[PDB]
């Protein structure tokens, strides 16, 4: 089956970081997972990552540090309209000061902090902190 790919992905890197690891193997490589981890890399929670290529769908390998505490998925994907936002981020984050809800908009995939400056609502995907 593997109904939702992204939802199975994050639990590995969540589990792996707890035990004390710094290399993982996540499959089967969706484009959606790439742009997620790109945003998550900029802020600094993970390091550079290598995309292995296969014809089947690829495999991805990540280098990570203890800075991450947990990245979760939120499924199914609800809408946000920039007044629903404040209610979401209260429940899902440890603090106002830091933590980053991610979402996708027509202006691309980004954190919530950026979307507020573009006046774009959209569909929420996950979170991390």
């Amino acid at each position: 089956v593997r109904m939702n790919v992204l939802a199975d992905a994050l639990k590995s890197i969540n589990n792996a970081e707890k035990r004390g690891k710094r290399q993982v193997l996540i499959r089967p490589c969706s484009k959606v997972i790439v742009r997620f981890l790109t945003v998550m890399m900029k802020h600094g929670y993970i390091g550079e990552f290598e995309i292995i290529d296969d014809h089947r769908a690829g495999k991805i390998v990540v280098n990570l540090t203890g800075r991450l505490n947990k990245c979760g998925v939120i499924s199914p994907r609800f809408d946000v309209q920039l007044k629903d936002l404040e209610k979401w981020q209260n429940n899902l984050l440890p603090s106002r000061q830091f933590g980053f809800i991610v979402l996708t908009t027509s202006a691309g995939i980004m954190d919530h902090e950026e979307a507020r400056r573009k006046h774009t609502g959209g569909k929420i995907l996950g979170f991390f902190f």
Binding site: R22, Q23, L25, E50, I52, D54, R56, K59, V61
Partner: protein, 84 residues
């Protein structure tokens, strides 16, 4: 696990003794072979897991016996791969 092990670059057969679809790239574990048996003097090429009787045009008319795995040869000789 020592819980710090590399996974980018594996050992030549100490981390490529694994199941073939649990490797980083999927490889077959099979090969071809350029055979020239001495009852059918022709350069035949045959797959390792024959799955079926390979016939001969010489005095003989059998070259392989299929089994549950690699097919054993009746009296044949000359193994190549070549390369793959």
């Amino acid at each position: 696990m020592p819980l710090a092990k590399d996974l980018l670059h594996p050992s030549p057969e100490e981390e490529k003794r694994k199941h073939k679809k649990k490797r980083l790239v999927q490889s077959p574990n099979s090969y071809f072979m350029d055979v020239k048996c001495p009852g059918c003097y022709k350069i035949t090429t045959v797959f390792s897991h024959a799955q079926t009787v390979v016939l001969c045009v010489g005095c003989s008319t059998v070259l392989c016996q299929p089994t549950g795995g690699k097919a054993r040869l009746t009296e044949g000789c000359s193994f190549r791969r070549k390369q793959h």
